[PDB]
XYZ file of C-alpha atoms in Angstrom:
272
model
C -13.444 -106.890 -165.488
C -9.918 -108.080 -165.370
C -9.274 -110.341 -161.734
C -6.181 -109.522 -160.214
C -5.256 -105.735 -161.931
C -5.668 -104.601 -158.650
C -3.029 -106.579 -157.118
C 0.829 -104.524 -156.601
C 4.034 -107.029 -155.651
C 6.536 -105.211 -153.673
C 9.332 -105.868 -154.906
C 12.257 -103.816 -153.420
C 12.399 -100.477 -151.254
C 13.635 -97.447 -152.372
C 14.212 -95.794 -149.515
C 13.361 -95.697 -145.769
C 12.814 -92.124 -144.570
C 12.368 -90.862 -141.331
C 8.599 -91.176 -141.640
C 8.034 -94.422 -143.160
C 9.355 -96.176 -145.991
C 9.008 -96.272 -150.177
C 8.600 -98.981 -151.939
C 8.632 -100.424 -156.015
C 5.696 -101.449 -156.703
C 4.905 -104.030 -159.792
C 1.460 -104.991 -160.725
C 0.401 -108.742 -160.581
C -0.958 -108.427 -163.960
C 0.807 -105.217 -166.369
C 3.837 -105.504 -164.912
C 3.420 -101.878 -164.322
C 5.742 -100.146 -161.685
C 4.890 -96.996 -159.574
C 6.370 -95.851 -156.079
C 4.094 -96.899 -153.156
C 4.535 -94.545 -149.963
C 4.009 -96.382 -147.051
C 3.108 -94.833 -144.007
C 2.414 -95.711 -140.011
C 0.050 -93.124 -139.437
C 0.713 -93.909 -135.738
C 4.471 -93.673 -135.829
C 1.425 -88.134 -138.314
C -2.850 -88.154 -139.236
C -3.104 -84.164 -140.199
C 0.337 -84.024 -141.753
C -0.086 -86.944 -143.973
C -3.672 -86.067 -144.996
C -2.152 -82.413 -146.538
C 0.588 -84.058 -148.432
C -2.140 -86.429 -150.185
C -4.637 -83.670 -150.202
C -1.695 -81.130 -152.241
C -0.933 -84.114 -154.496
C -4.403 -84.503 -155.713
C -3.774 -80.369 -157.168
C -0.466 -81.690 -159.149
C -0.433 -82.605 -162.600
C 2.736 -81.679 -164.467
C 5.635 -83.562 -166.295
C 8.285 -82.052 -164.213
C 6.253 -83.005 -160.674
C 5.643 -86.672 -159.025
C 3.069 -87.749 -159.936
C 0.037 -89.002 -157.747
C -1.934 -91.916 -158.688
C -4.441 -92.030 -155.631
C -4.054 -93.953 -152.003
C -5.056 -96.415 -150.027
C -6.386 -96.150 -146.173
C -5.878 -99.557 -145.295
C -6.403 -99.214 -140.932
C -4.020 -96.846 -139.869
C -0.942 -97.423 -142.759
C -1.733 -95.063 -145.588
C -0.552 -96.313 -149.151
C 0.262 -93.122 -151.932
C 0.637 -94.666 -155.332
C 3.398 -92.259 -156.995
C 4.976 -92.333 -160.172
C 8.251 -94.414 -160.244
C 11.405 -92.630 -161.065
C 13.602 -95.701 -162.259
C 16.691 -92.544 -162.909
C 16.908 -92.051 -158.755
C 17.612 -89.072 -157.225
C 19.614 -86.119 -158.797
C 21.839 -85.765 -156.103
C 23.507 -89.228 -157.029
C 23.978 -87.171 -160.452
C 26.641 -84.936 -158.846
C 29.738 -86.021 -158.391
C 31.742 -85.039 -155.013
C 33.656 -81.717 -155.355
C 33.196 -81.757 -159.449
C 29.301 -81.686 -160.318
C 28.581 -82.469 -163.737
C 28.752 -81.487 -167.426
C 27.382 -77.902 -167.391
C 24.724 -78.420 -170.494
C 23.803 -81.079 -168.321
C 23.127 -79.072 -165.033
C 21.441 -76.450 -167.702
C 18.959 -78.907 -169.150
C 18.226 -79.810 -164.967
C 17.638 -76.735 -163.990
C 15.700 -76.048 -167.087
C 13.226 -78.668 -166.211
C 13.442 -77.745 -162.315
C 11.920 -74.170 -163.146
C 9.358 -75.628 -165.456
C 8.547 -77.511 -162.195
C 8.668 -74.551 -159.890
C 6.911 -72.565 -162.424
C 3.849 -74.557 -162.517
C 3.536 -75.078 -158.661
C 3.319 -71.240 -157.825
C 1.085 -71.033 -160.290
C -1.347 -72.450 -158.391
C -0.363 -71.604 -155.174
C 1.930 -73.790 -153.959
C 4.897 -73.632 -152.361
C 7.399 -76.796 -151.939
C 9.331 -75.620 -149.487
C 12.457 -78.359 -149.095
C 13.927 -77.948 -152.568
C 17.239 -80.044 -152.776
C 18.772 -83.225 -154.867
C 17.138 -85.683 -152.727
C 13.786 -84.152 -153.714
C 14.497 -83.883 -157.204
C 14.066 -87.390 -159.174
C 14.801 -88.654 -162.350
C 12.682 -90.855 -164.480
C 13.999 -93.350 -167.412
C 14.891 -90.266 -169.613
C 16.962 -88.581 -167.259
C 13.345 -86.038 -166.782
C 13.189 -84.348 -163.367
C 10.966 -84.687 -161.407
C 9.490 -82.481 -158.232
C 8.914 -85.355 -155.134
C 7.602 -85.386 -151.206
C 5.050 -82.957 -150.711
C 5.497 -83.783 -147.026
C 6.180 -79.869 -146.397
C 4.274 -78.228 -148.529
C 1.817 -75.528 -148.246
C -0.885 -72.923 -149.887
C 0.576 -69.901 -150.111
C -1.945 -68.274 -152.681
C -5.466 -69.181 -152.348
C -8.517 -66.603 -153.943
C -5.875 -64.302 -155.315
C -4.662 -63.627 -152.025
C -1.169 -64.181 -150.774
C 0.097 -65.434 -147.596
C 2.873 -64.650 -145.991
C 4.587 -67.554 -144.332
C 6.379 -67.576 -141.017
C 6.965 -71.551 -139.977
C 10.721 -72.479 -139.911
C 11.022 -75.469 -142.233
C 13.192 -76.789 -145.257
C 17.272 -78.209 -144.748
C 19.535 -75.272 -143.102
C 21.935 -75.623 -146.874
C 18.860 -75.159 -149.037
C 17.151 -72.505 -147.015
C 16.758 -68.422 -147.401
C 18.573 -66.309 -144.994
C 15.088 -64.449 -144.876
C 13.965 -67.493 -142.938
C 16.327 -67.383 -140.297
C 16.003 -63.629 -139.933
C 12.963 -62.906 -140.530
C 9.102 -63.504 -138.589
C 7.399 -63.487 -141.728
C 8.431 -63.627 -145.498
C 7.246 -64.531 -149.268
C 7.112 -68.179 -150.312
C 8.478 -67.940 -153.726
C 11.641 -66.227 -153.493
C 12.524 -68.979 -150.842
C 12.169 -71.669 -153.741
C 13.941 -69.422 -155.808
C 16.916 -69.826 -153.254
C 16.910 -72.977 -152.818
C 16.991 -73.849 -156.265
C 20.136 -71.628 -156.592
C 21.636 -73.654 -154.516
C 20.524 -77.040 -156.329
C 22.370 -75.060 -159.220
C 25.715 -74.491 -157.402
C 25.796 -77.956 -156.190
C 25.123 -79.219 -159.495
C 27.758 -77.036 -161.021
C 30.448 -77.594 -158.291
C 29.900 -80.985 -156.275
C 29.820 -79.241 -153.776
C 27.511 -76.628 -151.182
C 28.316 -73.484 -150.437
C 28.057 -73.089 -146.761
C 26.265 -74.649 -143.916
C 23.472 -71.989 -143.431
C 22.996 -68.645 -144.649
C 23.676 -66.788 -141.764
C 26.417 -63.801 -141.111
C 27.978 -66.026 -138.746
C 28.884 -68.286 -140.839
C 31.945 -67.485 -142.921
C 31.474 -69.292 -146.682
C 28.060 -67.306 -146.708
C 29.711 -63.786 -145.163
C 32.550 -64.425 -148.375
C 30.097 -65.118 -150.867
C 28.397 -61.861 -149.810
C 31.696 -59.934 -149.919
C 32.062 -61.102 -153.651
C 35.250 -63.424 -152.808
C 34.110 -65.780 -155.469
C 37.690 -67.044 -155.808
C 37.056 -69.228 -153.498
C 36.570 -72.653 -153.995
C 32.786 -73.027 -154.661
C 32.387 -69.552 -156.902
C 36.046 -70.393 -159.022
C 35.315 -73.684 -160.451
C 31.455 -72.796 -162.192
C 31.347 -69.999 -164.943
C 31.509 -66.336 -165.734
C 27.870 -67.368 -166.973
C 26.276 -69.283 -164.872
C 28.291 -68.084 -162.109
C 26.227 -64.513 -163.293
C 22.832 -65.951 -162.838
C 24.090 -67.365 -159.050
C 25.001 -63.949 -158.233
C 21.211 -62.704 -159.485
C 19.430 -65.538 -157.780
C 21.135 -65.592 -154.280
C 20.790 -62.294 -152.787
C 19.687 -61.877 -149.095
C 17.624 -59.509 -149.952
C 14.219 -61.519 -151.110
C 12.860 -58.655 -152.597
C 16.028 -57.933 -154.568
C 16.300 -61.308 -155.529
C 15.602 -62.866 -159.119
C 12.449 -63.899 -160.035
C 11.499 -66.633 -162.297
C 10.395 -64.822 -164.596
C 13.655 -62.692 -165.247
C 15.338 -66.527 -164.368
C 13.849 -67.018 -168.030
C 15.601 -64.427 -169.382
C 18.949 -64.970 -168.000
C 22.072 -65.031 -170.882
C 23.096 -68.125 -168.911
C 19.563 -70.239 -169.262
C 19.382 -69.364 -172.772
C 22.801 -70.140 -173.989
C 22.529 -73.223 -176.666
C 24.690 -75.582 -174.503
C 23.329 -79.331 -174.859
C 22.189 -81.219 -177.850
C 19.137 -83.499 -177.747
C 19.062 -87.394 -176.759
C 21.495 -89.173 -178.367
C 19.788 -90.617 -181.755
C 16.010 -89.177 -181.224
């Protein structure tokens, strides 16, 4: 009915990744503004057509969302939803983190998030603050589906075995292991969104034996650096959710009922 409501004015990029580029989007005729991901499929054909594919399966407040695409040739065009708050790693502030109701309310909505993608099956599998945006009401939001994957499909589970993620984010089960569960791997990783949130800062490099932050942290010296400057509370759930052992390790679930996650810490929105 309406001429030109099809018509999106790029107006500024919001950042160029390694595969392509994102753009803000504003339509010629609402003014509306949504995320446009562009991308040379001749710069991947397969890899790109799962990430759209998984993002027709999301629909929840805590997770990007996707409006649809555009072939176009060979550069595909996702329509996501615009996240005017950025990315929660620009939230956390170099060797300090932030307010603790703050990083509560966070990782509050990050579980929500997490919650609802297992429960149908998928896993994210790159969980950090560069994946995690905000949107005008400080809301987080779940972004790039780029990784991805099924993990549950008819009821049945599969194990995963492919090597993927960011070495600071990842489960030592991953680097030690030929197979493993997908959800206690999101688990870890979103401990680890917790302690940087908490502490401005990461823990160690990889979580590997060799490496001597991670061996510490296993040997309880939580006087150092990292460990001293969060919380005998939250500090309590960290020790629950990052446990080499995967099967040992915290589940969501039991995340819920954690003294830490359910300690009244942060009021609601200032005047609402």
């Amino acid at each position: 009915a309406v001429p030109f409501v099809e018509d999106w004015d790029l107006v500024q990029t919001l950042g160029e990744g390694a595969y392509g580029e994102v753009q803000l989007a504003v339509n010629r005729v609402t003014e509306e503004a949504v995320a446009v991901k562009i991308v040379d499929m001749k710069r991947c054909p397969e890899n790109i057509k799962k990430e759209i594919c998984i993002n027709k399966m999301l629909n929840h407040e805590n997770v990007v969302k996707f409006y649809g695409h555009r072939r176009e040739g060979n550069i595909q065009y996702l329509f996501l939803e615009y996240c005017s708050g950025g990315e929660l790693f620009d939230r956390i502030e170099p060797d300090i983190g932030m307010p603790e109701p703050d990083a509560q309310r966070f990782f509050h909505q990050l579980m929500a998030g997490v919650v609802y993608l297992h429960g149908i099956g998928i896993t994210h599998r790159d969980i950090k603050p560069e994946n995690l945006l905000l949107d005008e009401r400080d809301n987080l939001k779940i972004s790039d589906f780029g990784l991805a994957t099924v993990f549950r499909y008819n009821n049945r589970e599969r194990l995963l075995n492919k090597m993927c993620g960011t070495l600071p984010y990842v489960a030592p089960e991953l680097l030690k292991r030929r197979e493993f569960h997908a959800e206690p791997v999101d688990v870890w990783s979103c401990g680890i969104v917790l302690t940087a949130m908490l502490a401005g800062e990461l823990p160690w490099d990889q979580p590997s034996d060799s490496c001597q932050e991670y061996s510490d942290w296993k040997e309880k010296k939580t006087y150092l650096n990292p460990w001293k400057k969060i919380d005998s509370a939250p500090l309590a759930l960290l020790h629950k959710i990052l446990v080499e052992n995967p099967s040992a390790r915290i589940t969501i679930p039991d995340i819920k009922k954690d003294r830490w996650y359910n300690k009244p810490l942060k009021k609601g929105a200032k005047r609402p």
